Amino acid sequence: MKHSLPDLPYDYGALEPHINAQIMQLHHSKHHAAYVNNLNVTEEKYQEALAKGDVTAQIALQPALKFNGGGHINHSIFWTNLSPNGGGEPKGELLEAIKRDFGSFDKFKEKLTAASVGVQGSGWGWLGFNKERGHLQIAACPNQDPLQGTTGLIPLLGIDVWEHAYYLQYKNVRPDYLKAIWNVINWENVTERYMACKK
């Protein structure tokens, strides 16, 4: 078992004009590719350190493991959260949960937007599921810190607000990017992730 770069499930230009082909190609073929390759490198070092009982060396590898590991986890989810067939609103039980937990779909969108706009530096906004409480929850994460690994929330929808996710097209104006991304959210996927949490 090595970790592998998943293929993007649509063409690089499939999200235009919301997210351009240049961004999608760099983001997938350069950024994600680097995280998974560097993850495998870090994991092999960690296995060596673990088998030798070298605790210092394990601890020294944690930043790279969290960063590259998180990068792989986060982007793998992100690509499935987007789709040319996306946008609009979810339906069914997910929609019911959104209304119940956030008041309305628009109030939810404002809350996830606010979380995403509010990241200072690099990071992600998330809609997650709190297994303990049995309800939806919004959280922000710095850098590539992954949601489940660092908070326990099960990821449903992630919004990447690293500058590489938007800068070529939207420059400094992160809010223009967050307005555009709502048009390509794959609610079919977010719904599947939500229904997998409930039983």
Place this chain on the structure above:
Amino acid sequence: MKHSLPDLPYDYGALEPHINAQIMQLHHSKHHAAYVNNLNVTEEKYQEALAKGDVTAQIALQPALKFNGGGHINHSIFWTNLSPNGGGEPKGELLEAIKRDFGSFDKFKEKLTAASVGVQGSGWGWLGFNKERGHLQIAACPNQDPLQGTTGLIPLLGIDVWEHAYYLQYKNVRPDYLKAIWNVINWENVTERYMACKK
């Protein structure tokens, strides 16, 4: 006393082909402008909270104050650290200190490059002066955390490795950007900052 956006001391295209005019214009007129304006906003809120003794409100403002305050501090130094008249090596006492503390100028460049390349997410690489020890020191800082405010080191040379500093021109390849930036380092300015530390 309000904080103010300092004018850039050369034309937006003065650093071409090392850093392009589009980057310089966005970086100064959008990014820095936002930090100083948001700094002034945060500072006024903080003065209000301070005068009321509202400790909760002071603490809630710290992230914005450090981020925008640091953004203003960092970029103000950064613009003076670059120049169309830059590149090459420093001379005099700065050069002597570099050789003494790092072995050689090239060994120093490798160490500051390594610090800058090593930032995971957004941040800065710094050459600083340790007043206590009386010598040079390299450090990295996350996001806009400023060097003197968070470590006590006096900043001499800063390298911005936020994606907005390089992405339009160099895309994901941060090492191409760090190779290019050596050509525009204003050693006259770094020398002035160094001599101001010594007495």
Place this chain on the structure above:
Amino acid sequence: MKHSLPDLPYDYGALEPHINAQIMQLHHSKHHAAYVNNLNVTEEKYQEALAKGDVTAQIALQPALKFNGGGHINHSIFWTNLSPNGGGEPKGELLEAIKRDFGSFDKFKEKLTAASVGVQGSGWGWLGFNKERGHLQIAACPNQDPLQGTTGLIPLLGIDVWEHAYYLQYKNVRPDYLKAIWNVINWENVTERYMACKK
């Protein structure tokens, strides 16, 4: 304003046998007193730095302001959260909220105990109110980071798990302290704080 050490609402021995008199006296008269005194020193330094527009100094003072400010906020709440007349369960709307959000009072105790036991190093366990979601929420905070200032949750009940809160009596056995403190929870105060969050 010039912050002051609040009077303890009861005798130093009033929470025996659950928290001994030596601990209460130290905790109030030395620890909380130090936070107040250092908060006042830091706030005066911040006033000087604001007047000069010294952003570096403002940032350098943040750790002392969060630590000592947070220490004052947290302990001022903590004293009111305990009582010689405390223990048992709350009643009315707070108990209804606890049952709705955590399943039962005993499951709530389990979760707040677990958050408090889980703190690695110094910190606090909290029951808070989430104003946006209109429900209760458990969180943990490191060091003296205060709940409202760092998370937006309104504090209802805090459990101090700094070693100074229990060590003289319980030594390393934090879970024994956690079991004992349920006997002195002032549910009247927690109820007042909860009702204040609602209109």
Place this chain on the structure above:
Amino acid sequence: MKHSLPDLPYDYGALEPHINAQIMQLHHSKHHAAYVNNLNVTEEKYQEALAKGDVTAQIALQPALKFNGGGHINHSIFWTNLSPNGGGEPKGELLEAIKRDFGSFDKFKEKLTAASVGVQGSGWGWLGFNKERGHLQIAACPNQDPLQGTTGLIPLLGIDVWEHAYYLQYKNVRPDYLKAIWNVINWENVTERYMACKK
């Protein structure tokens, strides 16, 4: 490997009056023992997660691995840094290094004391060796974050300023503990660690 609690190099009462026997016994047999036991549990969980390629689980275990792993690393060094035959000043090349890098032995003590007193919450003060710069360096570390694993500096002398290291004897008065511990520093061990850093 299966990590083990090392035997203490002396009797629990051998550092009296400076660190009392009750503290040493607790510190070794309960605190350090817990770090070892929890390190072993966490390392077995990491082995399971590596075998499955569960990156989320790997990341979720990082806090426990750094905390307990760091706790084992730090305390294993600390015991060897103290001795009933300790105190006074080092000699030879280590004393020459201390004088060169800090001005004098008394100025070195001032600086390491100040780093150790300055820790807000739980942590450690360290004298370390910087291999790249070929000189001594003082640093502070939060919680159980280990020196080498988090900074690259090689540990020479550690001062534990967790409340459990002093509280039963010194209560809140950390500076008194800091003054007393100079009487039991095992400069032979610190010297061995220093000579090992050089060729």
